[PDB]
Ligand binder design. Structure first.
Ligand SMILES: C[C@H](CS(N)(=O)=O)c1ccccc1
Ligand SMILES: C[C@H](CS(N)(=O)=O)c1ccccc1
Lengths: 195, 195
């Protein structure tokens, strides 16, 4: 038995498990299956520790998982001194991906929702701190926060539901790109055989 | 897309991941790769949460993982009010497996080592508490503990190294039984293709 070839087979299998768990995390996010998302996220986190070197595609995969993790924790010790949605904005702006119309829409929706979720939770001091970290339009947005005007028409256009719908659209592309991964494809074949 | 068939494919893949991680946990235990064992154990724990119903063979797999986890923590919040080696003894005596000569050897070696590791660590009050929970031979073993006679010939026959050698022998059988699991076999094929 060669220790080096065994380690290589374990690295190949870790790569396969990573893709499968990203696919599962995406479907759970899309479906709103919170507990399933939590478990899959925990598994992806554990599996990602088994890898010490990542390819360009594997880095894209783990960063999509981290982005979705922060988006799901948006309204929830987290060392970072910023909110989950601000942390999602940093991951989003650094992922190796096209900066198309959809990228800017999600970016601006997360920017507004990082402030709005603090107002929804009644923490208006925090909402101002988030605004200062991210940002004529600024003066109007600052006036809104100051007057606890949570349901202003601006917030109804840049809503939480709109942020989630735009991100779910991106998830569907990722779900389609990885729908052909080895582990999921093999498992599906076994299920159809039964059946 | 049928939610039920996707959930089924995820259950098939969880089963495959469980077998692969047990195989990896066994090799890490056999090789003495502590940090690798810790990571694999963490991954098996996370993955096992993705399963809510287990077959007879899957139950055997997770219990072997739990047994090896307690053996590896033998000399280390753990709610249980017993030591890791006493907890390994409970898992060992309840696993669905043959009670052959090797089973009794490992059982008796763990029984003696649950006491001896407390003496090695200088906690002789705990060594007596372990002895009382597990157990003419008893009176002689109690006299040994009472006199802090850690290096008595009895302990050199029922040593830690002997306990580990007997368990590693069992691990090799499990490693051979699961060496043909789908995930590991597929990964090995890919590695050979490269080579
Ligand atoms: C705790 C995880 C680690 S991992 N390896 O990406 O699973 C995480 C890190 C950074 C942002 C979100 C989430
Ligand atoms: C924490 C793990 C849980 S699991 N699901 O078996 O990984 C464990 C439980 C019992 C004994 C040893 C270890």
């Amino acid at each position: 038995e060669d220790a080096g070839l065994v380690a290589e087979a374990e690295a190949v299998a870790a790569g396969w498990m990573l893709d499968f768990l990203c696919l599962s995390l995406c479907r759970a996010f899309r479906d709103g299956r919170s507990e399933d998302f939590r478990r899959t996220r925990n598994s992806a986190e554990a599996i990602i520790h088994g890898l010490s070197s990542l390819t360009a595609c594997q880095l894209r995969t783990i960063y999509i998982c981290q982005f979705l993790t922060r988006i799901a924790a948006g309204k929830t010790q987290f060392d970072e001194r910023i909110t989950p949605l601000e942390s999602a904005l940093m991951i989003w702006g650094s992922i190796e991906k096209e900066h198309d119309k959809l990228h800017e829409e999600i970016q601006n929706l997360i920017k507004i929702q990082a402030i709005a979720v603090c107002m929804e939770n009644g923490n208006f001091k925090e909402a101002e701190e988030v605004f200062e970290r991210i940002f004529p339009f600024k003066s109007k947005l600052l006036m809104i926060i100051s007057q606890k005007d949570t349901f202003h028409s601006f917030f109804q256009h840049f809503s939480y539901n709109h942020m989630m719908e735009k991100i779910k659209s991106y998830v569907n592309y990722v779900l389609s790109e990885k729908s052909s991964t080895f582990l999921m494809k093999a498992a599906a074949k076994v299920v159809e055989s039964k059946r």
